[PDB]
């Protein structure tokens, strides 16, 4: 029907979609209008809401419609589907839609199928069919989807048990896994080489008398009886070996349990609002249908809905990989389940504890039990077998209400297939839930459109073809998958927009969980609480947290490999405290003595081997070897630890839309995608198994033709640019304006040490002697542990092994906590004799003699992956979370009156740090990996900034514990509520794509068409120096403000935000279980004794000489009360906003803000001149210094607007961010009119004087004596210019050349000519532009049917 003034335009929070612009034969806008005055679900005791009753109440109260807008922005008829009485358009014999441009679509007189149960749904996305401009894909979701954010269905924390001796927090279940006395015989037995020399090798398996080099022999064998009476049977399964069990916490064994979150019916377990079955049952009511709306505004039959096509979530879970039916399981199978379970860590690749959003049980299945595989059996040989269908079924990865409707949105047509790539998740996202698009739905229509099939493929399927060569940015990213699709990419989807013809699916993505890739030691859980909480799904921080001392040397050791038969603390050299210092050199002797004797035997004879090789390495090493790092081979992720809770990378993907339209509906998976039904098959399984015949899941690998994660840069260069990236909270750059090599912190309130950049930090160490080998003169970064030379005044370019491992003193040290001894190998005629002690003579020490002099998160060693901590996975995570400004910073000073981090507590210059590196309060444990935590502290709170300037800083920060105090620190997000789901609608500006990620308009500038030497991304952040923009940044629901990111006529991305929600939230914060903060992550108290920063009891006095050993966290090691308050990011936000000043210019406190990206020059992001001796890292760092403001005041970086024109990364200029007083619930964006909530001046398609001549005005006889077809050109469909004056009123003022008469419907038999009066709107107004219909031509519109009536 006609307009509904009680409905105003609104923005679909899932996709930032408010209106679909319509350029072409069917112009105007398809705006989402709703009763914005409706309170929604009784919102403005945390009672639960029954989905059916809530849906009925919203249908009866909330009113939604599709407002059609003509091209000039005049609000045409609403399409209130609930109040609409549609009719299926008729079709001719060829299958095309019967559609006269004036009679409209031939209405069959019957409503579309199952419309009566669909009308009450809600238009939340419109996609115009390019093949048919009058055909639109209107996405319908239940009204409850739109108002799910009002349900306040926060993710439940686990219940305590209550007083705890583990010092855990937020119901963290942490306790050092104890050796199972009953299962002590299950320790993996070392197997010696079957050939070739005794010696005194007590460090390679020989406990006290064996002395041999023994590899742990994992034997998983079938029983001798090959008969299938009880199918395949196991007689030995060393993967089942669990000599370390979950400790009995006060009698009850501390175990990840669903009931930790509560019982479904005061801790309420987060169930999804509706199960995937609950949506599949009653699809019309509960699914997101795709109604095919045939729209012709100026025709008599404007509206015609042909198909409804419920996007069945089961149509996507049917295409889920079979491994996703058992997501608490992975292809590592039983050993990995046991390892994570005893480590109090989520098991499998997708645990419901980590991601309750994709499980119909949500948090009621959130445990490590019921994996669909036998885990707790009396006979270990029977463990690891797939549970039968009659047995207790596992909780599969599903598409429940939150996850489904996060995967609902961003409709993108291609040919006859509409691909619903999903939204950013915010329509169903709670503070601590991360509902995301798990994949792409597709309504594949036939050519006629009568019948459509709805499918959905998980993003794992579409991204199975991901490889390193498919990105110009970070390589080895945790995007690799395996045949089981353990990597579950779930995207906060910006949208699938076409830069020409390449389907850009952009937004943010959950890469494979790298934060919990390094599995902690079984007796180091209570020390590294943050990694335990990350592992067990509690700490939803996808970011790699630096807790490396408590790591196992590798995470791939089965529990049998964890305990040694000797009295040694761990099973070194197979399983010990991660210490790259203690790692073995991959030299020929060491490899051939520890790996070669069992490398050939590995896998063969049903026996894998854990080599006596000391496999140790830092964060980058763990990510490289056991994250699903991207390789050159698709589906080569031999190790998908888990998946990220929230999106952990920026993402954009050049997909092949031809494949997506032609991809199979029902995805056929083979046995290779299924997890092995037993432990023997899993043991002897191959990572890369050729797809079985009759399976099409491999056809989805070419779907992702290419991808990017933001910047088209190598990792360390990305770190430099991240350090140039302002922290949007206060606008201060993460580098803290560090001048790189030009800073005073190099060996020679303005500048401080930088967060992610090592350039100019520490020492310019030559890595020639480091690990035995261009020169690669690398910056150590902060936390350097360089040994002083024998001279004393010159620090060596490396760390001596004796220093790093404490053997310079030759007890209970952080260098060799597992009492590792120096091991050497002598090759005496292919008799590779391993012996304890130093190398001496011709023996080659197994350990590296010279190590990279940085073991801290700042460790960025391209020459040494094992000591590198900055990894491309963590770099992508840091980039994403720095755009969100939600990177956790470890702080032990709460900023209160007593726990205040003063400026004097922190030093940055190398002059102060060389004498005492503790002055740089680098935790080197607990903080986020890949960054300098003091630098992040300065970027957030600016303690040194305010101290030097004059102290208004919050006082929050990490300080190295002094004397005997323990740093009882915690990671805190700085209070920014931007989530990696704060991903706006994708838009195309020329060759670039753009979407608002958090407060940063991200522009993939050279992704679709990559440009060599370009940064790959322009970042346009909200200017926190501006009070309005700062409040938008510092909003508890800052994405609820976002309204759109439309690319303007100048190619710039104007992102409109609705600040009215920001102001309402600020007022409610000025007037008034995890806190309901979107970035409130359940961080745990990282407790580190001061002695961990005083390793000296000679030649290396660096506090970071060893991995920083935490103390076992106890109830006494709890968080400080003010520090625990800081774990609520609302408290950190309050402190930072107090630091920002309270000018609060209510003149008139603008209710909306249009942030337009700067006009980026051709040199914006260009490194071609920069890169064209010096490393690319150093060149890019110095270039960003050249763009730093050359040279506090309310602790907000002034927007100097320097570097935004050259780097492309910067904050919104004051002119670039226009503060508009009117609120914007939604935006109507016609190709000419931009209307905030539909209000404002409608555009002018042309002068009102040029009008169609009324039927009487034209003679109708001379006009229609000659055939109609001769009165216009039948191919241009334009009335001849000699005949335009004789159809329309042309005033003398208007040039007739400006007017063309598009012929819409010619009928020679009746002799009716029907024309669209089109005025020429010049682009930017020679004679170039667009011939756009003149809606003022007639009262009906731009179209008129002249027929002899």
């Amino acid at each position, epitope marked *: 029907n006609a307009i509904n003034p009680r409905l105003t335009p609104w923005t679909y929070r899932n996709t930032s979609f408010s209106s679909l612009p319509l350029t072409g034969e069917n112009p105007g806008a398809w705006a989402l209008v709703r009763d914005n005055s409706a309170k929604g679900i009784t919102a403005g005791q945390q009672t639960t809401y029954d989905p059916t009753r809530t849906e009925a109440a919203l249908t009866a109260s909330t009113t939604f419609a599709l407002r059609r807008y003509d091209l000039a922005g005049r609000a045409l008829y609403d399409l209130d589907f609930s109040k609409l009485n549609p009719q299926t358009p008729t079709r001719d014999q060829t299958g095309q839609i019967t559609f006269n441009p004036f009679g409209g679509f031939g209405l069959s007189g019957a409503a579309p199928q199952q419309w009566n149960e669909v009308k009450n749904k809600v238009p939340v996305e419109v996609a115009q069919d390019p093949s048919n401009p009058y055909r639109f894909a209107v996405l319908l979701v239940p009204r409850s989807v739109v108002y799910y954010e009002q349900l306040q269905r926060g993710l439940g924390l686990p219940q305590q048990r209550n007083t705890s001796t583990t010092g855990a927090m937020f119901g963290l279940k942490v306790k050092n896994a104890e050796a199972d006395t009953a299962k002590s015989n299950e320790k993996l037995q070392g197997a010696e080489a079957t050939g070739s020399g005794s010696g005194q090798s007590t460090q390679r398996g020989g406990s006290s008398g064996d002395t041999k080099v023994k590899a742990l022999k994992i034997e998983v064998k079938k029983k001798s009886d090959s008969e299938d009476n009880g199918q395949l049977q196991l007689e030995k399964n060393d993967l089942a070996n669990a000599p370390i069990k979950r400790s009995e916490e006060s009698g009850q064994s501390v175990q990840l349990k669903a009931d930790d979150f509560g019982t479904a019916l005061s801790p309420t377990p987060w169930r999804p609002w509706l199960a995937t079955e609950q949506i599949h049952k009653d699809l019309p009511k509960w699914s997101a249908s795709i109604l095919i709306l045939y729209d012709a505004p100026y025709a008599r039959n404007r509206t015609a809905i042909d198909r409804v096509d419920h996007l069945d979530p089961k149509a996507m879970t049917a295409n889920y990989p079979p491994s996703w039916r058992t997501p608490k399981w992975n292809h590592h199978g039983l050993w990995d389940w046991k390892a994570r379970d005893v480590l109090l860590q989520t098991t499998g690749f997708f645990n419901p504890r980590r991601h309750p959003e994709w499980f119909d049980g949500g948090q009621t299945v959130a445990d490590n039990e019921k994996t669909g595989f036998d885990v707790d059996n009396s006979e270990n040989t029977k463990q690891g077998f797939q549970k039968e269908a009659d047995s207790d079924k596992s909780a599969p990865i599903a598409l429940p209400f939150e996850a489904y409707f996060a995967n609902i949105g961003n409709l993108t047509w291609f040919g006859q297939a509409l691909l619903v790539f999903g939204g950013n998740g915010h329509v169903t996202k709670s503070a601590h839930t991360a509902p995301l698009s798990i994949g792409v739905f597709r309504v594949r229509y036939n050519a006629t459109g009568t019948s459509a099939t709805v499918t959905g493929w998980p993003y794992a399927l579409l991204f199975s073809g991901m490889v390193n060569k498919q990105t110009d940015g970070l390589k080895d990213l945790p995007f690799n998958n395996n045949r089981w699709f353990e990597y579950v990419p779930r995207m906060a989807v910006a949208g699938a927009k076409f830069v020409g013809r390449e389907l850009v699916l952009a937004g943010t993505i959950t890469m494979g969980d790298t934060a919990t890739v390094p599995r902690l030691l079984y007796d180091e859980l209570e020390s590294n609480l943050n990694l335990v909480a990350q592992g067990q799904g509690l700490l939803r921080e996808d970011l790699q947290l630096f807790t490396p001392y408590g790591w196992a040397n590798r995470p791939d050791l089965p529990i049998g490999a964890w305990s040694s038969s000797s009295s040694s603390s761990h099973n070194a050299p197979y399983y010990f405290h991660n210490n790259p210092d203690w790692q073995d050199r991959p030299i020929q002797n060491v490899v051939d003595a520890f790996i070669k004797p069992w490398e050939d035997k590995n896998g063969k004879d049903d026996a894998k081997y854990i080599y006596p090789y000391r496999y140790s390495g830092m964060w980058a090493w763990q990510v490289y070897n056991w994250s699903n790092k991207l390789t050159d081979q698709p589906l080569s992720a031999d190790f998908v630890n888990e998946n990220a809770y929230q999106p952990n990378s920026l993402f954009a993907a050049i997909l092949n839309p031809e494949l997506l339209a032609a991809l199979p509906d029902k995805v056929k998976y083979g046995k290779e995608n299924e997890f092995a039904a037993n432990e023997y098959e899993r043991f002897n399984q191959k990572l890369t198994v050729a797809p079985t015949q009759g399976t099409n899941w491999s056809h989805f690998s070419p779907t992702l033709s290419r991808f990017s994660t933001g910047f088209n840069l190598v990792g360390s260069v990305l770190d430099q640019v991240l350090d140039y990236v302002p922290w949007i909270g206060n606008g201060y750059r993460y580098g803290n304006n560090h001048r790189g090599v030009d800073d005073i912190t190099a060996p020679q309130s303005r500048s401080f040490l930088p967060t992610f950049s090592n350039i100019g930090v520490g020492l310019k160490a030559n890595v020639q002697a480091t690990l035995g080998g261009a020169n690669l003169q690398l910056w150590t970064g902060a936390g350097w542990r360089n040994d002083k030379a024998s001279s004393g005044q010159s620090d060596e370019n490396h760390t001596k092994f004796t220093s790093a491992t404490g053997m310079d003193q030759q007890g209970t040290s952080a260098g060799n906590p597992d009492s590792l001894k120096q091991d050497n190998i002598s090759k005496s005629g292919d008799s590779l004799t391993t012996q304890d002690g130093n190398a001496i003579d011709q023996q080659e020490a197994t350990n590296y003699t010279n190590l990279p002099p940085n073991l801290t998160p700042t460790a960025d060693w391209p020459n040494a992956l094992s000591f590198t901590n900055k990894n491309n996975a963590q770099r992508a995570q840091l980039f994403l979370r720095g755009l969100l400004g939600s990177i956790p910073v470890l702080v032990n000073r709460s900023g209160s009156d007593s726990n205040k981090f003063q400026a004097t507590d922190q030093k940055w210059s190398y002059t102060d740090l060389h004498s005492d590196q503790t002055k740089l309060n680098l935790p080197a444990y607990g903080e986020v990996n890949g960054l300098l935590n003091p630098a992040l502290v300065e970027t957030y709170f600016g303690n040194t900034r305010a101290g030097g300037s004059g102290t208004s800083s919050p006082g929050i920060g990490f300080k190295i514990p002094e004397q005997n105090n323990d740093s009882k620190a915690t990671l805190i997000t700085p209070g920014l509520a931007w989530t990696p789901q704060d991903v706006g609608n994708l838009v195309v500006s020329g060759t670039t794509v753009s979407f608002q990620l958090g407060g940063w308009l991200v522009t993939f500038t050279d992704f679709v068409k990559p440009r060599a030497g370009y940064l790959g991304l322009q970042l346009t952040g909200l200017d926190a120096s501006d009070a309005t923009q700062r409040a938008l940044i510092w909003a508890p629901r800052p994405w609820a403000a976002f309204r759109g990111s439309w690319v303007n006529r100048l190619g710039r991305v104007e992102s409109v935000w609705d600040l009215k929600g920001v102001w309402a939230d600020q007022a409610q914060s000025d007037s008034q279980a995890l806190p309901e903060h979107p970035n409130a992550l359940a961080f745990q108290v990282s407790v580190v004794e001061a002695s961990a920063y005083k390793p000296n009891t000679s030649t290396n006095s660096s506090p970071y000489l060893h991995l920083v050993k935490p103390k076992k966290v106890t109830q006494s090691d709890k968080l400080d009360d003010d520090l625990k308050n800081l774990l609520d990011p609302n408290q950190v936000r309050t402190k930072l906003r107090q630091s920002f000043g309270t000018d609060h210019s209510t003149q008139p406190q603008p209710q909306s803000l249009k942030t337009t990206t700067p006009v980026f020059g051709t040199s914006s992001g260009n490194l071609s001149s920069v890169l064209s001796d010096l490393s690319p890292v150093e060149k890019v760092s110095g270039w960003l210094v050249g763009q730093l403001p050359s040279t506090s005041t309310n602790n907000l970086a002034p927007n100097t607007n320097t570097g935004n024109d050259v780097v492309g990364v910067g904050r919104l200029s004051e002119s670039n961010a226009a503060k508009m007083n009117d609120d914007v619930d939604g935006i109507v964006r016609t190709p000419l009119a931009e209307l905030l909530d539909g209000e404002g001046q409608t555009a002018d398609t042309g002068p009102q004087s040029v009008k169609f001549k009324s039927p009487d005005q034209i003679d109708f006889n001379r006009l229609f004596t000659h055939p109609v077809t001769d009165l216009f050109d039948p191919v241009t469909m334009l009335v001849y210019d000699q005949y335009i004056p004789l159809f329309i009123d042309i005033p003398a003022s208007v040039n007739p050349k400006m007017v*063309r008469l598009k012929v819409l419907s010619f009928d020679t038999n009746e002799q009716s000519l029907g024309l669209r009066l089109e005025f020429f709107k010049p682009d930017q107004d020679p004679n170039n532009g667009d011939f756009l219909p003149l809606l003022t031509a007639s009262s009906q519109g731009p179209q008129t049917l002249f027929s002899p009536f």
Partner: antibody
Amino acid sequence: EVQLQQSGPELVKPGTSMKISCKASGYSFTGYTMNWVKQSHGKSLEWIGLINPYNGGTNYNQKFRGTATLTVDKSSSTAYMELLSLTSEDSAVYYCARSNYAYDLLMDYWGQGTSVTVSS
Amino acid sequence: VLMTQTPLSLPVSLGDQASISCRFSQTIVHSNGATYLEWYLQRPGQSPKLLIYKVSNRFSGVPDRFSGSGSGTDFTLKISRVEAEDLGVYYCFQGSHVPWTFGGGTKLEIKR
């Protein structure tokens, strides 16, 4: 066969309105529509417009709607293009081409080409 | 439509498969169904001669060596054999949308 002889290479000063003839033979001039296309030296063809000679009805593209005017003379079966106020970018080879609409043949038989340069 | 015709210069030898691509922002199917994509060949110093009309149909007096094929926004002119007469610039031309835009031009050049 259908034959089109346009005007010869024409020298013209800027701002001078000149007419490019297009002699049509081998077919009925009125039936099939004469389209004019611009090809600037070294760049792509640009469809100036079309004229139905049966009624002389013109449909230009707006890039040439005000610059070039299409006329026809049915007595001698000749098409024309009065390029109003020729300027530097209007220095090109101008092709007249008859177009079938019964067989959906847009252009096809093009004239030899009138190379027009407007350098003064 | 945003008119793009790739490649700008197609290198091809004598008697090889010369595929010239014409790509569109949105489909150029006309209102009367007949998609007005026409492939013209302009020999050096010669008028643009039509070869392919209505996307696929071959022009009268035009050798079978040329064959247009495509739908929607994709239109490739494939030449099975490239002779000396094939020398010249190739234009894809849409007539369903005003302005009738020719492709950027594809000069078939002998590949030495």
